[PDB]
PDB file of C-alpha atoms and ligand atoms in Angstrom:
ATOM      1  CA  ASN A   1      24.681 -13.518  42.773  1.00 48.53           C
ATOM      2  CA  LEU A   2      22.726 -15.429  40.509  1.00 46.36           C
ATOM      3  CA  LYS A   3      21.814 -15.326  37.186  1.00 43.93           C
ATOM      4  CA  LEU A   4      18.524 -16.013  34.674  1.00 44.05           C
ATOM      5  CA  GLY A   5      18.416 -15.339  31.102  1.00 40.91           C
ATOM      6  CA  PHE A   6      15.600 -13.620  30.480  1.00 39.87           C
ATOM      7  CA  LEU A   7      15.311 -13.961  26.243  1.00 40.83           C
ATOM      8  CA  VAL A   8      12.373 -12.710  24.141  1.00 38.45           C
ATOM      9  CA  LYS A   9      11.233 -13.044  20.508  1.00 36.44           C
ATOM     10  CA  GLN A  10      10.484  -9.637  19.106  1.00 36.15           C
ATOM     11  CA  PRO A  11      12.554  -7.318  21.189  1.00 36.98           C
ATOM     12  CA  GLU A  12      11.647  -4.172  19.237  1.00 36.68           C
ATOM     13  CA  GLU A  13       8.146  -4.284  21.036  1.00 39.04           C
ATOM     14  CA  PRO A  14       7.325  -2.505  24.417  1.00 35.71           C
ATOM     15  CA  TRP A  15       5.206  -5.914  25.389  1.00 35.98           C
ATOM     16  CA  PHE A  16       8.556  -7.176  25.176  1.00 33.47           C
ATOM     17  CA  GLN A  17      10.394  -4.433  26.994  1.00 31.29           C
ATOM     18  CA  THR A  18       8.214  -3.860  29.723  1.00 33.51           C
ATOM     19  CA  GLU A  19       8.526  -8.201  30.525  1.00 37.67           C
ATOM     20  CA  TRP A  20      11.754  -6.746  30.659  1.00 35.04           C
ATOM     21  CA  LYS A  21      11.663  -4.165  33.187  1.00 34.39           C
ATOM     22  CA  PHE A  22       9.386  -5.672  34.760  1.00 33.25           C
ATOM     23  CA  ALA A  23      11.441  -9.179  34.902  1.00 34.31           C
ATOM     24  CA  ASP A  24      14.422  -6.533  36.188  1.00 33.60           C
ATOM     25  CA  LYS A  25      12.293  -5.898  38.947  1.00 33.04           C
ATOM     26  CA  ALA A  26      12.365  -9.012  40.148  1.00 31.93           C
ATOM     27  CA  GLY A  27      15.807  -9.348  40.447  1.00 30.11           C
ATOM     28  CA  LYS A  28      16.168  -6.021  42.395  1.00 27.43           C
ATOM     29  CA  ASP A  29      13.390  -8.077  45.108  1.00 26.59           C
ATOM     30  CA  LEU A  30      14.704 -11.147  45.180  1.00 24.63           C
ATOM     31  CA  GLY A  31      18.425 -10.675  44.956  1.00 24.72           C
ATOM     32  CA  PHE A  32      19.414 -12.001  41.104  1.00 23.48           C
ATOM     33  CA  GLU A  33      20.303 -10.911  37.660  1.00 21.10           C
ATOM     34  CA  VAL A  34      18.657 -10.406  35.245  1.00 20.46           C
ATOM     35  CA  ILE A  35      20.372 -11.050  31.814  1.00 21.84           C
ATOM     36  CA  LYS A  36      18.236 -10.178  28.932  1.00 23.93           C
ATOM     37  CA  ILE A  37      18.967 -11.183  25.693  1.00 26.00           C
ATOM     38  CA  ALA A  38      16.897 -10.813  22.223  1.00 28.35           C
ATOM     39  CA  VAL A  39      16.255 -14.635  20.195  1.00 30.11           C
ATOM     40  CA  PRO A  40      14.270 -13.549  17.228  1.00 29.43           C
ATOM     41  CA  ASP A  41      15.400 -16.755  15.423  1.00 30.75           C
ATOM     42  CA  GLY A  42      16.136 -20.638  16.471  1.00 26.15           C
ATOM     43  CA  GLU A  43      19.553 -19.971  15.563  1.00 27.34           C
ATOM     44  CA  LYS A  44      19.782 -17.241  17.998  1.00 26.34           C
ATOM     45  CA  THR A  45      17.283 -18.545  21.190  1.00 27.19           C
ATOM     46  CA  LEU A  46      19.929 -22.339  20.705  1.00 26.30           C
ATOM     47  CA  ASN A  47      23.305 -20.259  20.464  1.00 28.09           C
ATOM     48  CA  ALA A  48      21.481 -17.651  22.930  1.00 25.16           C
ATOM     49  CA  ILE A  49      21.730 -20.750  25.763  1.00 20.43           C
ATOM     50  CA  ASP A  50      24.582 -21.850  24.769  1.00 20.95           C
ATOM     51  CA  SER A  51      26.452 -18.019  25.852  1.00 21.47           C
ATOM     52  CA  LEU A  52      23.418 -18.212  28.808  1.00 22.88           C
ATOM     53  CA  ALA A  53      25.892 -21.125  29.897  1.00 25.78           C
ATOM     54  CA  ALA A  54      29.031 -19.788  30.040  1.00 28.46           C
ATOM     55  CA  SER A  55      27.652 -16.818  31.523  1.00 26.80           C
ATOM     56  CA  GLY A  56      27.134 -19.304  33.990  1.00 26.44           C
ATOM     57  CA  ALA A  57      23.254 -18.813  33.749  1.00 27.85           C
ATOM     58  CA  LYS A  58      21.346 -21.216  35.638  1.00 27.49           C
ATOM     59  CA  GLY A  59      17.622 -21.193  34.018  1.00 28.55           C
ATOM     60  CA  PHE A  60      16.561 -18.684  32.481  1.00 32.78           C
ATOM     61  CA  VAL A  61      12.220 -17.390  31.086  1.00 32.69           C
ATOM     62  CA  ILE A  62      11.565 -17.312  27.573  1.00 32.29           C
ATOM     63  CA  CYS A  63       9.781 -16.152  24.587  1.00 30.95           C
ATOM     64  CA  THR A  64      10.498 -18.545  22.240  1.00 32.99           C
ATOM     65  CA  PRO A  65      10.531 -17.168  18.054  1.00 33.91           C
ATOM     66  CA  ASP A  66       9.094 -21.012  17.183  1.00 36.42           C
ATOM     67  CA  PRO A  67       7.014 -23.370  19.114  1.00 39.51           C
ATOM     68  CA  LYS A  68       8.589 -26.322  17.489  1.00 39.58           C
ATOM     69  CA  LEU A  69      11.772 -24.960  18.848  1.00 39.22           C
ATOM     70  CA  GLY A  70      10.429 -26.646  22.275  1.00 39.38           C
ATOM     71  CA  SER A  71      12.310 -30.109  22.415  1.00 42.60           C
ATOM     72  CA  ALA A  72      15.501 -28.391  21.332  1.00 42.39           C
ATOM     73  CA  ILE A  73      15.656 -25.956  23.924  1.00 39.67           C
ATOM     74  CA  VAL A  74      15.088 -28.078  26.684  1.00 43.05           C
ATOM     75  CA  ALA A  75      17.490 -30.881  25.842  1.00 42.15           C
ATOM     76  CA  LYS A  76      19.757 -28.042  26.270  1.00 44.23           C
ATOM     77  CA  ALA A  77      18.379 -26.920  29.225  1.00 43.75           C
ATOM     78  CA  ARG A  78      18.473 -29.902  30.935  1.00 46.41           C
ATOM     79  CA  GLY A  79      22.218 -31.058  29.720  1.00 44.25           C
ATOM     80  CA  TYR A  80      23.871 -27.371  31.406  1.00 44.32           C
ATOM     81  CA  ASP A  81      21.380 -27.459  34.456  1.00 44.73           C
ATOM     82  CA  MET A  82      18.907 -25.459  33.872  1.00 40.84           C
ATOM     83  CA  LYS A  83      15.320 -25.084  34.831  1.00 38.19           C
ATOM     84  CA  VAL A  84      12.957 -23.468  31.399  1.00 38.33           C
ATOM     85  CA  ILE A  85       9.590 -21.073  32.143  1.00 39.31           C
ATOM     86  CA  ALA A  86       7.638 -20.419  29.012  1.00 38.70           C
ATOM     87  CA  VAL A  87       6.335 -17.361  29.248  1.00 36.70           C
ATOM     88  CA  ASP A  88       3.530 -16.145  26.474  1.00 34.25           C
ATOM     89  CA  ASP A  89       3.762 -19.017  23.783  1.00 34.35           C
ATOM     90  CA  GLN A  90       3.588 -22.644  24.222  1.00 33.39           C
ATOM     91  CA  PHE A  91       5.754 -25.119  23.523  1.00 33.78           C
ATOM     92  CA  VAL A  92       5.355 -27.859  21.211  1.00 33.27           C
ATOM     93  CA  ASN A  93       6.610 -31.232  20.538  1.00 34.07           C
ATOM     94  CA  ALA A  94       6.559 -32.089  16.818  1.00 37.81           C
ATOM     95  CA  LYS A  95       3.411 -33.551  15.482  1.00 37.74           C
ATOM     96  CA  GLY A  96       2.478 -29.327  17.713  1.00 36.21           C
ATOM     97  CA  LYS A  97       1.003 -31.551  20.502  1.00 38.27           C
ATOM     98  CA  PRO A  98       1.463 -28.483  23.594  1.00 37.12           C
ATOM     99  CA  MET A  99       4.750 -29.507  25.942  1.00 34.36           C
ATOM    100  CA  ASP A 100       2.784 -29.989  29.060  1.00 35.44           C
ATOM    101  CA  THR A 101       5.565 -30.745  30.856  1.00 33.26           C
ATOM    102  CA  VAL A 102       7.255 -27.317  30.851  1.00 35.95           C
ATOM    103  CA  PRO A 103       5.426 -24.894  33.379  1.00 33.23           C
ATOM    104  CA  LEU A 104       4.020 -22.033  31.469  1.00 30.10           C
ATOM    105  CA  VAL A 105       2.758 -18.420  31.940  1.00 27.64           C
ATOM    106  CA  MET A 106       0.615 -16.368  28.835  1.00 27.55           C
ATOM    107  CA  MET A 107      -1.957 -14.212  28.935  1.00 28.96           C
ATOM    108  CA  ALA A 108      -6.438 -15.961  28.536  1.00 32.24           C
ATOM    109  CA  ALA A 109      -6.327 -15.638  24.527  1.00 30.09           C
ATOM    110  CA  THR A 110      -9.363 -17.481  24.187  1.00 30.15           C
ATOM    111  CA  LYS A 111     -11.323 -14.523  26.901  1.00 30.78           C
ATOM    112  CA  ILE A 112      -9.371 -12.109  25.480  1.00 33.40           C
ATOM    113  CA  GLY A 113      -9.603 -13.059  21.907  1.00 30.98           C
ATOM    114  CA  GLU A 114     -14.109 -12.828  22.679  1.00 29.85           C
ATOM    115  CA  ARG A 115     -13.517  -9.493  24.394  1.00 31.18           C
ATOM    116  CA  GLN A 116     -11.453  -8.222  21.255  1.00 31.00           C
ATOM    117  CA  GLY A 117     -14.942  -9.622  19.150  1.00 28.92           C
ATOM    118  CA  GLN A 118     -17.974  -8.356  21.741  1.00 27.15           C
ATOM    119  CA  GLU A 119     -15.853  -4.881  21.480  1.00 30.81           C
ATOM    120  CA  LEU A 120     -15.545  -5.220  17.367  1.00 29.72           C
ATOM    121  CA  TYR A 121     -19.431  -5.854  17.025  1.00 30.53           C
ATOM    122  CA  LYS A 122     -20.470  -3.107  19.922  1.00 31.34           C
ATOM    123  CA  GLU A 123     -17.999   0.101  18.521  1.00 31.90           C
ATOM    124  CA  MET A 124     -20.161  -1.266  15.227  1.00 35.22           C
ATOM    125  CA  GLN A 125     -23.727  -1.228  16.375  1.00 33.20           C
ATOM    126  CA  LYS A 126     -22.635   2.238  17.294  1.00 35.25           C
ATOM    127  CA  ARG A 127     -21.416   3.439  13.582  1.00 35.68           C
ATOM    128  CA  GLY A 128     -24.485   2.196  12.184  1.00 36.16           C
ATOM    129  CA  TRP A 129     -23.425   0.133   9.759  1.00 36.62           C
ATOM    130  CA  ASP A 130     -24.623  -1.551   7.600  1.00 33.27           C
ATOM    131  CA  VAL A 131     -24.556  -5.261   8.162  1.00 33.57           C
ATOM    132  CA  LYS A 132     -24.835  -5.401   4.019  1.00 38.45           C
ATOM    133  CA  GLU A 133     -21.814  -4.296   3.304  1.00 40.22           C
ATOM    134  CA  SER A 134     -19.404  -4.593   6.051  1.00 42.45           C
ATOM    135  CA  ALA A 135     -16.644  -7.637   6.172  1.00 42.05           C
ATOM    136  CA  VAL A 136     -14.115  -8.959   8.884  1.00 44.07           C
ATOM    137  CA  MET A 137     -10.751  -9.629   7.653  1.00 44.04           C
ATOM    138  CA  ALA A 138      -9.084 -11.626  10.593  1.00 46.89           C
ATOM    139  CA  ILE A 139      -5.563 -11.655   9.916  1.00 45.38           C
ATOM    140  CA  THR A 140      -4.161 -15.484  11.622  1.00 46.15           C
ATOM    141  CA  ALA A 141      -0.904 -17.061  12.313  1.00 43.59           C
ATOM    142  CA  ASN A 142      -2.608 -20.610  12.348  1.00 44.25           C
ATOM    143  CA  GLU A 143       1.076 -22.177  13.989  1.00 43.18           C
ATOM    144  CA  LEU A 144       0.987 -20.462  17.133  1.00 46.21           C
ATOM    145  CA  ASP A 145      -1.841 -21.436  19.716  1.00 44.03           C
ATOM    146  CA  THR A 146      -1.663 -18.981  21.494  1.00 45.87           C
ATOM    147  CA  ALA A 147      -2.320 -16.551  18.356  1.00 44.70           C
ATOM    148  CA  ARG A 148      -4.737 -19.135  17.083  1.00 46.09           C
ATOM    149  CA  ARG A 149      -6.828 -19.795  19.821  1.00 46.79           C
ATOM    150  CA  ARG A 150      -7.228 -15.113  20.139  1.00 47.86           C
ATOM    151  CA  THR A 151      -8.343 -14.679  16.572  1.00 47.22           C
ATOM    152  CA  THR A 152     -11.036 -17.665  16.796  1.00 46.32           C
ATOM    153  CA  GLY A 153     -12.298 -16.083  20.083  1.00 44.82           C
ATOM    154  CA  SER A 154     -12.763 -13.416  18.319  1.00 43.90           C
ATOM    155  CA  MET A 155     -14.872 -14.990  15.410  1.00 45.03           C
ATOM    156  CA  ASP A 156     -16.603 -16.927  17.304  1.00 43.66           C
ATOM    157  CA  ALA A 157     -17.636 -13.884  20.007  1.00 44.26           C
ATOM    158  CA  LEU A 158     -18.504 -11.944  16.543  1.00 43.58           C
ATOM    159  CA  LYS A 159     -20.612 -15.099  15.063  1.00 45.84           C
ATOM    160  CA  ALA A 160     -22.063 -15.610  18.227  1.00 45.76           C
ATOM    161  CA  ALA A 161     -23.471 -12.390  18.537  1.00 46.58           C
ATOM    162  CA  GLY A 162     -25.240 -11.632  15.019  1.00 48.07           C
ATOM    163  CA  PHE A 163     -22.502 -11.344  12.533  1.00 48.01           C
ATOM    164  CA  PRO A 164     -22.694 -13.709   8.954  1.00 46.49           C
ATOM    165  CA  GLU A 165     -20.193 -15.939   8.744  1.00 46.54           C
ATOM    166  CA  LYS A 166     -19.752 -15.530   5.526  1.00 48.28           C
ATOM    167  CA  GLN A 167     -19.042 -11.986   5.217  1.00 48.93           C
ATOM    168  CA  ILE A 168     -15.702 -12.880   7.751  1.00 49.12           C
ATOM    169  CA  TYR A 169     -12.620 -13.451   5.852  1.00 53.37           C
ATOM    170  CA  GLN A 170      -8.976 -14.732   6.792  1.00 53.22           C
ATOM    171  CA  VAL A 171      -5.289 -14.422   5.633  1.00 53.73           C
ATOM    172  CA  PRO A 172      -2.596 -15.800   6.829  1.00 54.13           C
ATOM    173  CA  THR A 173       0.228 -13.259   7.548  1.00 56.72           C
ATOM    174  CA  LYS A 174       3.545 -14.339   7.361  1.00 55.68           C
ATOM    175  CA  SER A 175       4.677 -12.918   9.827  1.00 53.85           C
ATOM    176  CA  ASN A 176       3.910 -11.474  13.556  1.00 51.22           C
ATOM    177  CA  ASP A 177       4.386  -7.481  12.481  1.00 51.52           C
ATOM    178  CA  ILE A 178       3.402  -4.222  10.524  1.00 51.78           C
ATOM    179  CA  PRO A 179       5.207  -5.550   7.160  1.00 54.27           C
ATOM    180  CA  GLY A 180       3.756  -8.676   7.929  1.00 55.75           C
ATOM    181  CA  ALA A 181      -0.070  -7.899   8.605  1.00 55.18           C
ATOM    182  CA  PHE A 182      -0.160  -4.664   5.171  1.00 52.86           C
ATOM    183  CA  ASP A 183       0.864  -7.498   3.010  1.00 52.87           C
ATOM    184  CA  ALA A 184      -1.723  -9.536   4.056  1.00 52.91           C
ATOM    185  CA  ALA A 185      -4.953  -7.844   4.707  1.00 55.80           C
ATOM    186  CA  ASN A 186      -3.864  -5.853   1.369  1.00 55.12           C
ATOM    187  CA  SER A 187      -4.361  -9.125  -0.856  1.00 56.35           C
ATOM    188  CA  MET A 188      -7.983 -10.025   0.835  1.00 51.71           C
ATOM    189  CA  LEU A 189      -9.299  -5.541   0.068  1.00 53.48           C
ATOM    190  CA  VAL A 190      -8.437  -6.173  -3.976  1.00 53.06           C
ATOM    191  CA  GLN A 191     -10.302  -8.870  -3.561  1.00 53.13           C
ATOM    192  CA  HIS A 192     -13.650  -7.573  -1.173  1.00 56.32           C
ATOM    193  CA  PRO A 193     -14.312  -3.983  -3.438  1.00 56.17           C
ATOM    194  CA  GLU A 194     -18.147  -4.493  -2.911  1.00 58.23           C
ATOM    195  CA  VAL A 195     -16.988  -4.069   0.320  1.00 56.42           C
ATOM    196  CA  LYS A 196     -17.399   0.327   1.872  1.00 57.13           C
ATOM    197  CA  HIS A 197     -17.391  -1.237   5.692  1.00 62.66           C
ATOM    198  CA  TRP A 198     -13.253  -2.855   7.297  1.00 61.86           C
ATOM    199  CA  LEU A 199     -13.977  -4.718  10.669  1.00 62.57           C
ATOM    200  CA  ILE A 200      -9.834  -5.838  11.402  1.00 63.97           C
ATOM    201  CA  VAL A 201      -8.903  -8.509  14.146  1.00 63.45           C
ATOM    202  CA  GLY A 202      -5.678  -9.918  14.947  1.00 66.29           C
ATOM    203  CA  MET A 203      -3.953 -11.265  17.737  1.00 65.13           C
ATOM    204  CA  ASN A 204      -2.033  -8.387  18.968  1.00 65.10           C
ATOM    205  CA  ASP A 205      -1.788  -4.623  18.263  1.00 64.34           C
ATOM    206  CA  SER A 206       0.830  -4.607  15.408  1.00 63.92           C
ATOM    207  CA  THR A 207      -1.297  -7.463  13.261  1.00 66.85           C
ATOM    208  CA  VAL A 208      -4.086  -4.929  13.846  1.00 67.01           C
ATOM    209  CA  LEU A 209      -1.532  -1.592  13.126  1.00 65.19           C
ATOM    210  CA  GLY A 210      -0.882  -3.663  10.109  1.00 64.94           C
ATOM    211  CA  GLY A 211      -3.906  -4.167   8.287  1.00 65.07           C
ATOM    212  CA  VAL A 212      -5.165  -0.143   9.629  1.00 66.62           C
ATOM    213  CA  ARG A 213      -2.008   0.852   7.336  1.00 65.57           C
ATOM    214  CA  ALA A 214      -3.496  -0.975   4.279  1.00 68.01           C
ATOM    215  CA  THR A 215      -6.915  -0.317   4.101  1.00 69.67           C
ATOM    216  CA  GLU A 216      -5.710   3.478   4.391  1.00 69.92           C
ATOM    217  CA  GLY A 217      -4.063   2.305   1.332  1.00 67.19           C
ATOM    218  CA  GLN A 218      -6.277   0.905   0.131  1.00 65.96           C
ATOM    219  CA  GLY A 219      -8.386   4.640   0.612  1.00 64.08           C
ATOM    220  CA  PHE A 220     -10.666   3.549   3.128  1.00 66.18           C
ATOM    221  CA  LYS A 221     -11.145   6.439   6.293  1.00 64.40           C
ATOM    222  CA  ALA A 222     -11.431   6.457   9.803  1.00 64.62           C
ATOM    223  CA  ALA A 223     -14.916   6.568   9.806  1.00 68.57           C
ATOM    224  CA  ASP A 224     -14.783   2.778   8.403  1.00 68.84           C
ATOM    225  CA  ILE A 225     -12.371   0.641  10.335  1.00 70.55           C
ATOM    226  CA  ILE A 226     -12.452  -0.547  13.567  1.00 72.57           C
ATOM    227  CA  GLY A 227      -9.664  -2.397  13.899  1.00 75.95           C
ATOM    228  CA  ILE A 228      -8.925  -3.341  18.368  1.00 75.48           C
ATOM    229  CA  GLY A 229      -5.355  -4.474  18.726  1.00 75.33           C
ATOM    230  CA  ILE A 230      -4.575  -6.796  21.468  1.00 76.49           C
ATOM    231  CA  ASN A 231      -1.063  -5.639  24.043  1.00 77.15           C
ATOM    232  CA  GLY A 232      -1.957  -2.575  25.347  1.00 78.13           C
ATOM    233  CA  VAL A 233       1.429  -1.109  25.730  1.00 80.11           C
ATOM    234  CA  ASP A 234       2.279  -1.593  21.945  1.00 78.77           C
ATOM    235  CA  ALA A 235      -0.248   0.936  20.364  1.00 77.48           C
ATOM    236  CA  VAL A 236       0.569   3.621  22.701  1.00 77.20           C
ATOM    237  CA  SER A 237       2.039   5.658  19.236  1.00 78.96           C
ATOM    238  CA  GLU A 238      -1.084   5.702  17.909  1.00 81.69           C
ATOM    239  CA  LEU A 239      -3.922   6.096  20.486  1.00 84.10           C
ATOM    240  CA  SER A 240      -1.682   9.631  21.449  1.00 84.02           C
ATOM    241  CA  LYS A 241      -1.490  10.405  17.107  1.00 82.74           C
ATOM    242  CA  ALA A 242      -2.840  14.035  16.949  1.00 84.07           C
ATOM    243  CA  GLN A 243      -5.707  12.511  14.110  1.00 83.89           C
ATOM    244  CA  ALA A 244      -8.460   9.507  15.569  1.00 86.88           C
ATOM    245  CA  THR A 245      -7.239   6.935  12.407  1.00 88.97           C
ATOM    246  CA  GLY A 246      -9.138   3.074  11.340  1.00 86.97           C
ATOM    247  CA  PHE A 247      -7.202   1.847  14.916  1.00 88.69           C
ATOM    248  CA  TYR A 248      -9.596   2.275  17.825  1.00 87.96           C
ATOM    249  CA  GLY A 249      -8.198   0.711  20.729  1.00 85.73           C
ATOM    250  CA  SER A 250      -6.619  -2.247  22.214  1.00 86.74           C
ATOM    251  CA  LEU A 251      -6.883  -3.986  24.569  1.00 86.59           C
ATOM    252  CA  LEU A 252      -4.543  -3.690  27.452  1.00 88.63           C
ATOM    253  CA  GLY A 253      -2.960  -7.403  29.685  1.00 90.50           C
ATOM    254  CA  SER A 254      -0.602  -7.160  32.341  1.00 90.39           C
ATOM    255  CA  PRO A 255       3.894  -7.843  30.560  1.00 87.92           C
ATOM    256  CA  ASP A 256       4.022  -6.578  34.597  1.00 89.93           C
ATOM    257  CA  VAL A 257       2.649  -9.914  34.865  1.00 87.22           C
ATOM    258  CA  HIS A 258       4.112 -12.103  32.433  1.00 87.81           C
ATOM    259  CA  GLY A 259       8.056 -10.021  33.147  1.00 87.05           C
ATOM    260  CA  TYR A 260       8.221 -10.142  37.396  1.00 86.33           C
ATOM    261  CA  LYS A 261       6.361 -13.290  37.934  1.00 84.92           C
ATOM    262  CA  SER A 262       7.994 -15.439  35.677  1.00 83.35           C
ATOM    263  CA  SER A 263      10.581 -14.456  36.919  1.00 86.82           C
ATOM    264  CA  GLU A 264       9.903 -14.222  40.434  1.00 87.99           C
ATOM    265  CA  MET A 265       8.434 -17.933  39.917  1.00 89.27           C
ATOM    266  CA  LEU A 266      11.768 -19.218  38.255  1.00 91.52           C
ATOM    267  CA  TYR A 267      13.935 -18.196  41.249  1.00 90.80           C
ATOM    268  CA  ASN A 268      12.208 -19.612  43.453  1.00 89.61           C
ATOM    269  CA  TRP A 269      13.064 -22.977  41.934  1.00 87.95           C
ATOM    270  CA  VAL A 270      16.186 -22.080  40.847  1.00 85.12           C
ATOM    271  CA  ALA A 271      16.704 -21.032  44.484  1.00 87.01           C
ATOM    272  CA  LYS A 272      14.447 -23.015  46.928  1.00 82.94           C
ATOM    273  CA  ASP A 273      13.936 -25.622  43.722  1.00 81.68           C
ATOM    274  CA  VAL A 274      10.418 -25.043  44.604  1.00 82.22           C
ATOM    275  CA  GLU A 275       8.293 -26.039  41.654  1.00 79.99           C
ATOM    276  CA  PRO A 276       5.942 -23.814  39.316  1.00 82.19           C
ATOM    277  CA  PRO A 277       2.271 -24.030  38.223  1.00 79.03           C
ATOM    278  CA  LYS A 278       2.340 -26.393  35.524  1.00 75.23           C
ATOM    279  CA  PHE A 279      -0.344 -22.927  33.622  1.00 74.54           C
ATOM    280  CA  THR A 280      -0.525 -19.284  34.880  1.00 77.13           C
ATOM    281  CA  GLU A 281      -2.974 -17.924  33.260  1.00 78.51           C
ATOM    282  CA  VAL A 282      -3.309 -13.913  32.902  1.00 75.90           C
ATOM    283  CA  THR A 283      -6.811 -13.227  33.256  1.00 72.94           C
ATOM    284  CA  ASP A 284      -6.297  -9.241  33.308  1.00 74.64           C
ATOM    285  CA  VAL A 285      -7.647  -6.959  30.374  1.00 73.15           C
ATOM    286  CA  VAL A 286      -9.249  -3.316  29.918  1.00 74.29           C
ATOM    287  CA  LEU A 287     -10.259  -1.761  26.611  1.00 72.81           C
ATOM    288  CA  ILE A 288      -7.808   1.402  25.974  1.00 73.27           C
ATOM    289  CA  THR A 289      -9.333   4.100  23.403  1.00 72.08           C
ATOM    290  CA  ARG A 290      -7.733   7.252  22.871  1.00 66.35           C
ATOM    291  CA  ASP A 291      -9.733   8.977  25.794  1.00 63.87           C
ATOM    292  CA  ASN A 292      -8.695   7.115  28.299  1.00 62.94           C
ATOM    293  CA  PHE A 293      -5.883   5.824  27.510  1.00 63.45           C
ATOM    294  CA  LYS A 294      -3.236   7.414  29.179  1.00 65.55           C
ATOM    295  CA  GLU A 295      -5.195   7.409  32.769  1.00 67.89           C
ATOM    296  CA  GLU A 296      -5.315   3.102  32.620  1.00 64.82           C
ATOM    297  CA  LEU A 297      -1.187   2.931  31.487  1.00 62.57           C
ATOM    298  CA  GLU A 298      -0.710   5.340  34.398  1.00 62.07           C
ATOM    299  CA  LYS A 299      -3.626   3.503  36.798  1.00 62.95           C
ATOM    300  CA  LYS A 300      -2.043   0.394  35.516  1.00 64.02           C
ATOM    301  CA  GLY A 301       1.613   1.161  36.575  1.00 66.07           C
ATOM    302  CA  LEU A 302       2.779   1.264  33.376  1.00 68.07           C
ATOM    303  CA  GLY A 303       3.374   5.199  33.434  1.00 68.56           C
ATOM    304  CA  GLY A 304       3.992   6.699  30.163  1.00 69.85           C
ATOM    305  CA  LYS A 305       1.230   7.719  27.406  1.00 71.68           C
TER     306      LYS A 305
HETATM  307  O1  LIG B 401       1.854 -12.730  25.398  1.00 71.86           O
HETATM  308  C1  LIG B 401       1.174 -12.314  25.029  1.00 71.86           C
HETATM  309  C2  LIG B 401       1.931 -11.743  23.646  1.00 71.86           C
HETATM  310  O2  LIG B 401       0.979 -12.782  22.893  1.00 71.86           O
HETATM  311  C3  LIG B 401       2.884 -13.958  21.607  1.00 71.86           C
HETATM  312  O3  LIG B 401       3.845 -13.787  21.650  1.00 71.86           O
HETATM  313  C4  LIG B 401       2.777 -12.371  20.954  1.00 71.86           C
HETATM  314  O4  LIG B 401       3.545 -12.636  19.766  1.00 71.86           O
HETATM  315  C5  LIG B 401       3.102 -11.154  21.960  1.00 71.86           C
HETATM  316  O5  LIG B 401       2.464  -9.362  21.020  1.00 71.86           O
HETATM  317  C6  LIG B 401       2.190 -11.025  22.897  1.00 71.86           C
HETATM  318  O6  LIG B 401       0.436 -10.225  22.596  1.00 71.86           O
END
């Protein structure tokens, strides 16, 4: 009978789709209805809450399209006697300090990032690239913490592994999608004619994919590119292709956990006024490649690949 909202920034990415799916499950289990809304931008976010209130929802889980909407979201919520839980992306203040006060469930950004970096270097070593003619292209979205911590973690790990600091080139992307990353990567490539082999660093699948698509456009062959995405579920279409590409594999997270856990906690909070922990960090990761993606998806109950 109880209605709880599940707002996501990017409903077109399997990650978010899966979070929805597992929110549904939680609903089934606990006996509550999930109202699934896309909030791609700030306005739609604020409008969506209004709409929720109309429907007579008692709270919502949200991945905000903008961390800096935090204040507004909370205010609107309070006004409607709605409880909020943040998923994925953390609320920040005007000054861009994290709002500790809102319960969050997110991925262990740093740890996953560092695992990306490890695995990048590992595959490089495998291929016997000459470091001298190799480079790292780091496509960044520094304004998003969880993203920041990811790419920084990757760079740290690479630097730690012995990859020359001076051969790591960062480029900000305007959007956390393929088109965005494509533009970014493209602009960086034409600057570095000397490079023969690229490692591509990005916070998620799409970002890395964007990077890869760009390199192919500048006449790099698969052998000469290593990109490892983050998310896993986002990467399935790529890993499924006949031909191997620059996109070598992905770190599979737990969007199932994100969806289910966040919803479950909201309900309890709403229904039973059981205060969720302020911070939940999900540490799950597995490397999925062309060779294993199918197993691992099925293994994690994210069947289909
Ligand atoms: O929490 C994981 C989540 O982090 C951000 O929201 C990214 O945009 C997503 O694609 C995903 O990787």
